[PDB]
Write a protein that binds this ligand. Structure first.
Ligand SMILES: OC[C@H]1O[C@H](O[C@H]2[C@H](O)[C@@H](O)[C@@H](O)O[C@@H]2CO)[C@H](O)[C@@H](O)[C@@H]1O
Ligand SMILES: NC(=O)c1cccnc1
Lengths: 794, 138
């Protein structure tokens, strides 16, 4: 791409590219090697684009701040000047082109902004920014202005932003701290507010750019401008009698220009690195070469000691260096580009009125410091901490782990450390190694099937009769729901997990494939996510009940009873490890697919059903058949710590939710949709009492005005499974969970406390039920409200 | 840059068809997917460009490339400190909520509130991130 035997040089259009071309023509006269000098627009953006593809110029010129980024991307050759050459340039200039200890460019000249002023209009230039409004007012009497300079590039406004305390990156612990940015501190806000006020008060115009300010100063329309040494040549060509001097102070502090070292880098893709070194060291960085460039457009304070000794006698150069000494050499770290972009936007928005200074600089701060990275670090850490809490609860409260060698001591502090998570990994490790040792000599068909499983994605399905989603899907763990336990729940203590069935996903069939988990349909709303969770864990069965049932219980029983034989009498079994029936294998998300595949291989290998084996070892088994097999041999159960909250899901309505299922799930949406008149309320109240949904019962009673006659009607509901069998008063009194409903019915005169049951336990009263349950509170309530004690003959 | 784990020769042995300490190139990705790695097709083909069969020596070096480093306790602390306006070591629940809601990857409000509740071990509306970060290290 870059052609050998010539040198292409890129340099900004505001520099002396014709004088550089003369240096190139001398190089050609000595060597026969042509030098082409170009000045493309947006050079500092075009160079990394074309150079990343191995194209671009042999030599790129820019201020040094851009070069570390280039060096980090691999675009620059390391330069190799020896002691003699390095001694010809000022030491601080070499420091500007050092990146990660290596020299990545030749320094050319030091650039700093100065105040340039028209001596005929303004014989004594202002010492302070603060006096510029009054100077402008004086000059406006003759239609002239005090100051114009480029407001489109933040380089020119930075000296003022920095004057009272703004900074780019603080230097600390031997480097620029990329997370200590001073773009939105008090000093930066004060400087930019001063600029914005100059514009608001019509002393400057937000649209002024480089060309406009230059034309105005060089035609005598404005008394002052802010620019670098490269601009002096055009001022010389104009009539204007000008001076170059220290930038004005702000709040009594010097303006602090960011100082650039114009530098020449060699493209890492160049086949002309030796020619480029010869040109730069022995033609350009000489008295004659720099003089030709400088005569075209002044370079500033050149890096070459021998020429700078004379250039520094120039008061304009002395003033450049005085401003530089008040400022700061720019960092060359890769973060500079983003910094400049951020500040550019802030200046332009604040100058325009599109944003306030505070808002513009706040946004620039967040961009320049890259606070997204830190916010992500915080979020990831807190997610990991939540997961560790769930896993410590499981491993430290679950008695099954104590029966095995897998318990965790309760956490030392007020929360679990990440050890629980590490424990998980080790646990999964255990169950992986074991199963590997059981099937290590793997056959070709077994390896092919394991590979098919490894490369499969999963749908994770959670069914419910609750309304768990709107735009956001929110599923809460059992422990989280109640916090807003029986010994069976204590056996595993995974009740701070959300539970999912598992399906193969790479198919175009209607979702979900399966609607039951261990024969239970958990509800009409099937919520499906299609991606793993980093802290989930998988079991091959329900964790507490690891028994696969006979085939006539399975959801797709006819497929297996039709197509297979011996496997029908093998699949019903306990799925467990070496330590016995309660040795439930546990896999983390990393190890899931391997462990599933290996356990499937083991089952298939132990099978006498050759048709089944051949069905599984079909090299072109489609994912639906694969899911059939996995959901037959196993009841995979995936667990996600604490909660699932996401906008990335599918909801599939499998069927209507029945009234009783809605009542049982406290699905107020379905309940309100269904219970619109008094007969539906009769049904819904009976269902609430039968399922001990006291809150639902009280809601219904608040929405409808129940009467004695309503209770009489409820007694006639043979189509309701509860009132078909039981009296209303029986339902009110059978379980203490309905106490508050009973109270309601008694206090509002809806039931007779002494009504004798006419259905199950006929002749009894509510007091009989209360005494049977040993519900002291209900017993006492009934007796306080006139219950009869004892039973006489009629 | 790895040891003790030895990745898994175990896993390796599952795809060693002949037991010659080598596996085929076409299976490489699969063997890395069995261990929790997701290299692109381009990176797969570029690491195949280096060598078709691959042995366990070369297999270990390839997984070390893709293996990423856990964030350190110091890095977590610094990520918290950049949002600490007072430097006291505390971030208010409102400040942490603004941060985690408006910076970085989008989460639900529910997940953000759960993270805040989990981090606020005293229930005082403030999060002592230095204590909380030191506590999470075993
Ligand atoms: O405005 C941001 C810009 O500032 C500097 O660019 C200067 C450059 O140093 C000078 O040589 C001269 O050409 O004016 C430029 C401002 O327009 C940074 O060097 C540059 O990276 C940055 O984007
Ligand atoms: N709610 C469910 O669908 C479910 C899935 C797997 C295990 N337990 C419950």
């Amino acid at each position: 791409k870059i052609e050998e035997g010539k040198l292409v040089i890129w340099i900004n259009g505001d520099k002396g590219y014709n004088g550089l071309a003369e240096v190139g023509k001398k190089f050609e006269k000595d060597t026969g090697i042509k030098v082409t000098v170009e000045h493309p627009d947006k050079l500092e953006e075009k160079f990394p684009q074309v150079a990343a593809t191995g194209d671009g110029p042999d030599i790129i010129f820019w201020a040094h701040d851009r070069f570390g980024g280039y060096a980090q991307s691999g675009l620059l050759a390391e330069i190799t000047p020896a002691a003699a050459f390095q001694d010809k340039l000022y030491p601080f200039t070499w420091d500007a082109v050092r990146y990660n200890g290596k020299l990545i460019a030749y320094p050319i000249a030091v650039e700093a902004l100065s105040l340039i002023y028209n001596k005929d209009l303004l014989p004594n230039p202002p010492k302070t920014w603060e006096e510029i409004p009054a100077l402008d007012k004086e000059l406006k009497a003759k239609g002239k202005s005090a100051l114009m300079f480029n407001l489109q590039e933040p380089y020119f406004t930075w000296p003022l932003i920095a004057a009272d305390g703004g900074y780019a990156f603080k230097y600390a612990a031997g480097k620029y701290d990329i997370k200590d940015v001073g773009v939105d501190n008090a000093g930066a806000k004060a400087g930019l507010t001063f600029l914005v006020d100059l514009i608001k008060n019509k002393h400057m115009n937000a649209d002024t750019d480089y060309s406009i300010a230059e034309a105005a100063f060089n035609k005598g329309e404005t008394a002052m401008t802010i620019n670098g040494p490269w601009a002096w040549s055009n001022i010389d060509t104009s009539a204007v009698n000008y001076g170059v001097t220290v930038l004005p102070t702000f709040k009594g502090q010097p303006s602090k220009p960011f100082v650039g070292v114009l530098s020449a880098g060699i493209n890492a893709a160049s086949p002309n690195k030796e020619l480029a070194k010869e040109f730069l060291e022995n033609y350009l960085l000489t008295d004659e070469g720099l003089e030709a460039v400088n005569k075209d457009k002044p370079l500033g304070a050149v890096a070459l000691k021998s020429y700078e000794e004379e250039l520094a006698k120039d008061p304009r150069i002395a003033a450049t260096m005085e401003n530089a000494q008040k400022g700061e050499i720019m960092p060359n770290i890769p973060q500079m580009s983003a910094f400049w972009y951020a500040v550019r936007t802030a200046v332009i928005n604040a100058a325009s009125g599109r944003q306030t200074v505070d808002a513009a600089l706040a946004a620039a701060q967040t961009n320049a410091a890259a606070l997204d990275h830190c916010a992500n670090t915080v979020k990831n850490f807190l997610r990991k901490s939540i997961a560790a809490q769930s896993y410590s609860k499981m491993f430290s409260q679950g008695t099954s782990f104590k029966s095995l060698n897998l318990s965790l001591e309760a956490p030392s502090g007020a929360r679990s450390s990440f050890r629980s998570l590490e424990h998980l990994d080790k646990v999964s490790r255990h169950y992986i190694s074991e199963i590997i040792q059981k099937v290590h000599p793997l056959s070709s068909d077994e390896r092919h099937l394991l590979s098919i499983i490894i490369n499969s994605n999963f749908n994770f399905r959670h069914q419910s009769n609750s309304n768990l989603s709107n735009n956001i899907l929110n599923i809460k763990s059992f422990d989280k729901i109640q916090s807003e336990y029986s010994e069976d729940i204590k056996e595993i203590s995974n009740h701070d997990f959300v539970f999912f069935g598992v399906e193969i996903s790479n198919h175009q069939e209607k979702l979900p494939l399966n609607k039951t988990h261990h024969t239970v349909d958990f509800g009409a709303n099937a919520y499906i996510i299609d991606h793993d969770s980093p802290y989930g864990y998988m079991t091959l069965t329900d964790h507490f009940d690891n028994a696969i049932p006979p085939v006539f219980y399975h959801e797709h029983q006819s497929f297996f009873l039709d197509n297979f034989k011996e496997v029908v009498d093998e699949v019903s079994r306990y799925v467990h490890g070496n330590q016995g029936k309660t040795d439930v294998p546990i896999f983390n998300t990393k190890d899931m697919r391997l462990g599933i595949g290996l356990h499937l291989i083991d089952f298939i290998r132990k099978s006498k059903d050759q048709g089944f084996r051949e069905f599984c070892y079909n090299k072109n088994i489609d994912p639906v058949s694969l899911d059939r097999i996995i959901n037959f041999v196993f009841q995979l159960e995936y667990h996600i710590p604490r909660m699932l909250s996401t906008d990335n899901f599918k909801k599939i309505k499998l069927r209507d939710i029945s009234l009783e299922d809605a009542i049982k799930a406290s699905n107020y949406e379905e309940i309100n949709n269904k219970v619109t008149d008094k007969k539906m309320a009769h049904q819904a109240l009976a269902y609430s009492l039968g399922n001990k949904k006291a809150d639902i019962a009280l809601y219904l009673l608040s929405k409808f005005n129940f009467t004695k006659q309503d209770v009489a009607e409820m007694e006639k509901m043979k189509n309701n499974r509860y009132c078909n069998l039981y009296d209303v008063e029986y339902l009110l009194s059978k379980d203490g969970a309905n106490y508050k409903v009973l109270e309601y019915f008694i206090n509002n005169g809806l039931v007779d406390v002494n009504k004798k049951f006419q259905k199950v336990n006929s002749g009894d009263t509510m007091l009989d039920n209360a005494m049977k349950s040993k519900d002291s509170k209900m017993i006492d309530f009934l007796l306080k409200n006139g219950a009869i004690l004892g039973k006489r003959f009629e | 840059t790895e040891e003790q784990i030895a990745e898994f020769k175990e896993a390796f042995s599952l795809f060693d068809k002949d037991g010659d300490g080598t596996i085929t190139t076409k299976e490489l990705g699969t063997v890395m997917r069995s261990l929790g790695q997701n290299p692109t097709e381009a990176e797969l083909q570029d690491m195949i460009n280096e060598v078709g069969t691959i042995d366990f020596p070369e297999f270990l070096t390839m997984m070390a490339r893709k293996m990423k480093d856990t964030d350190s306790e110091e890095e977590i602390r610094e990520a918290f400190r950049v949002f600490d306006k007072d430097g006291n070591g505390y971030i208010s629940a409102a400040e942490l909520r603004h941060v985690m809601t408006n910076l970085g990857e989008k989460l639900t409000d529910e997940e953000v509130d759960e993270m805040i509740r989990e981090a606020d071990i005293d229930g005082d509306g403030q999060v002592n991130y230095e204590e909380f970060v030191q506590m999470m290290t075993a």
